[PDB]
Design a protein around this ligand. Structure first.
Ligand SMILES: *Cc1c(COP(=O)(O)O)cnc(C)c1O
Ligand SMILES: *Cc1c(COP(=O)(O)O)cnc(C)c1O
Lengths: 396, 396
């Protein structure tokens, strides 16, 4: 059976972790996977999640199976964060959410469901986007088309190329939007551009799918959700795949959400019964620990106040490193004016590095970055800033 | 998009939990989902898992992403439990295992992988089997055929019907076997019948897929794995989907394994690179808490010794209830000699109840059982044995 199975290529993000964790150079620098590192190069487990964990340890009676859609407290809290505390989709019982294993598990559940219960055939993803988007959707059986997104010469969103790309997307197609902190570019729509995108979706019939993985990482929690809420106020139907991996520091526990909205309580509940069928045929019900840590912090006034201090401290430190990377690059010899990376938000800088500059940087200098040139700014600390800036300019 | 989506039917096992948890009768009895209940009707979180959890709470530094295949300690321990501590598949680096979200997540990963990397088109499942088997495999794109398994008049395995069924299964097809504690019947092959099945797989070219969810629930840990080990010693290639939901009491944390074996180290490693690609396109990497609780208990001599006392106490109590159900049924009026259910092992009694006796029992008596007649013996306690036996005979 298995003798003509060729080896798969390594994943572009996760394969980096494979090779880093084998590199014996004392001074290697990771810059690759999207994990926050603190001042000391550690990705600590947050204190609000460690306090919630103490809680769960004392106050937990059973490990008995969670329902297919998981914890309803979780589902409620997530809807509040996404849509507003007191929103109309909440109040009209228009949204329904299932707890999934990460934003990836959410994005697959959406795909499986759309593939089996819907007429949709195409999903439109930004050029460039998170590399694994293509792979989740082709796995569902859907095909992925790309719409122009980022103008490299000026280092901006190219809103006209993005409009004109999508004008050959049909009514009935999915168009995946990045909630905030675009991966890889870090460039997001202005709210004024999001409401333009929102009425254009409506006039043209595209179903929106929001990948929301970095909420709290751009401006703030609520501020970050404005584009989705400009779209939610106009769309009768949309699906959002939420992740709590990043903003809660809960990467290996796999906590995310798939929230489905339809025109009314009945339609959404009918559609969610097929989402639950898709979840039962994949993994049967969701992993509880991650999600109940989220539900506990979001449900306690005090433990919540500790968490969003921790989240703003993470958002600030990266802003300080972003500053630092472009200053230190200037005095270290940089051929270019990298003053555009200060403009991008979230954990990542999309520099203009070529695939060969990136490959050279891991082979002689051992600083690991993704082949598109995406470097993780959250991975930069004041101790590694100088050796790294030096590596970049020697390859430049 | 969502207006012609018909509602899905409820899941046969999980839908029961939906209706039970709504029933306002004081005296309802669950008997449906395969969760162990203790003397008091509680599904407690085990003490060895609560001690391991204390551990993880004090000794955990990060929540940073686990690799696609999860924890390697876990992978090693699982292989030892399945194959023997000192086995040849271990020693020839022939087996590779990925940590999955439950046995369901394992069974899907196997299906996705076989569907995309293999020539296999058909999967053969026992008549009757776990209802969700059909649903996982059709979701992968595979079709499911049934092979005769249980002779209802005599209450046994019908080994000739099982041989003759499978003689119209091709070389290249998957034949799913239940490791031990067949769900629903509780009837397993004799080892003498498993080595017959093992050489017949070989002469005929079927790929074995073992669903192993109740290890430790029939005779004992190692004893239970003999059939799989009769098959592993002869098969160049096989896949096993392991679950630690049942024997560890870790149902909602979703810990299971997909272990792939091929003829040699190279072939298995080439094939596992595609399994990892299938995992990355589904959920990205596995949930850590459940699996590291397993790895901690299996790795500590003391915490391990506490766990297998807890597991044998669970296995004994069900044996006591099994006795009890057939005694109490006899003195409570039973029309039949239910002395066959004492012969079946694992958590479940497959009684001859019809779908209408089962439906009547939930509607007037509120005792909830699956529509095939499968009742969960682990759900029976000395306080509910008499009202339940009385309900059954009034419907008989
Ligand atoms: C990090 C990330 C994901 C993955 O989320 P998990 O919750 O870790 O599965 C998905 N999409 C984007 C855009 C991401 O940046
Ligand atoms: C309980 C059970 C499963 C599910 O295992 P999880 O680990 O809970 O996903 C799968 N197959 C069989 C036969 C089972 O009894």
């Amino acid at each position: 059976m298995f003798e003509n199975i060729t080896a798969a290529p390594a994943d572009p993000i996760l394969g980096l972790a494979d090779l880093f964790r084998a590199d014996e150079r004392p001074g290697k620098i990771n810059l690759g996977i999207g994990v926050y590192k603190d001042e000391t190069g550690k990705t600590p487990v947050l204190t609000s999640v460690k306090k919630a964990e103490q809680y769960l340890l004392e106050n937990e009676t059973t490990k008995n199976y969670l329902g297919i859609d998981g914890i309803p407290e979780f589902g409620r809290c997530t809807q509040e964060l996404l849509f507003g505390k007191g929103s109309a989709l909440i109040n009209d019982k228009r949204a329904r959410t299932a707890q999934t294993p990460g934003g990836t598990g959410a994005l697959r559940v959406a795909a499986d469901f759309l593939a089996k219960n819907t007429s949709v055939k195409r999903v439109w993803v930004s050029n460039p986007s998170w590399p694994n988007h293509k792979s989740v959707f082709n796995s569902a059986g859907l095909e992925v088309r790309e719409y122009a997104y980022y103008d490299a010469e000026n280092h901006t969103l190219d809103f006209d190329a993005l409009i004109n790309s999508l004008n050959e997307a049909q009514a009935g197609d999915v168009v995946l939007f990045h909630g905030c902190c675009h991966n890889p570019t870090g460039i997001d729509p202005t709210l004024e551009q999001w409401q333009t995108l929102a009425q254009l979706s409506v006039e043209k019939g595209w179903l929106p799918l929001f990948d929301f993985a970095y909420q709290g990482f751009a401006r703030g929690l609520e501020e970050d959700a404005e584009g989705l809420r400009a779209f939610a106020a106009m769309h009768k139907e949309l699906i959002v795949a939420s992740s709590y991996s990043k903003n809660f520091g809960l990467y290996n526990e796999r906590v995310g959400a798939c929230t489905l909205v339809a025109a009314d309580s009945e339609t959404v509940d009918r559609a969610f019964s097929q989402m639950k069928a898709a979840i039962r045929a994949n993994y049967s019900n969701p992993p509880a620990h991650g999600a109940s840590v989220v539900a506990t912090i979001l449900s306690n006034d005090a433990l919540r106040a500790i968490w969003e201090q921790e989240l703003t401290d993470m958002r600030q430190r990266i802003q300080r490193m972003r500053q630092l990377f472009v200053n230190t690059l200037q005095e270290k010899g940089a051929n270019r004016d990298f003053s555009f990376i200060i403009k991008q938000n979230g954990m990542f800088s999309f520099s203009g590095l070529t695939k060969e500059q990136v490959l050279r940087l891991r082979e002689e200098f051992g600083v690991y970055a993704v082949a598109s040139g995406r470097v993780n700014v959250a991975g930069m600390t004041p101790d590694n800033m100088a050796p790294l800036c030096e590596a970049i300019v020697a390859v430049l």
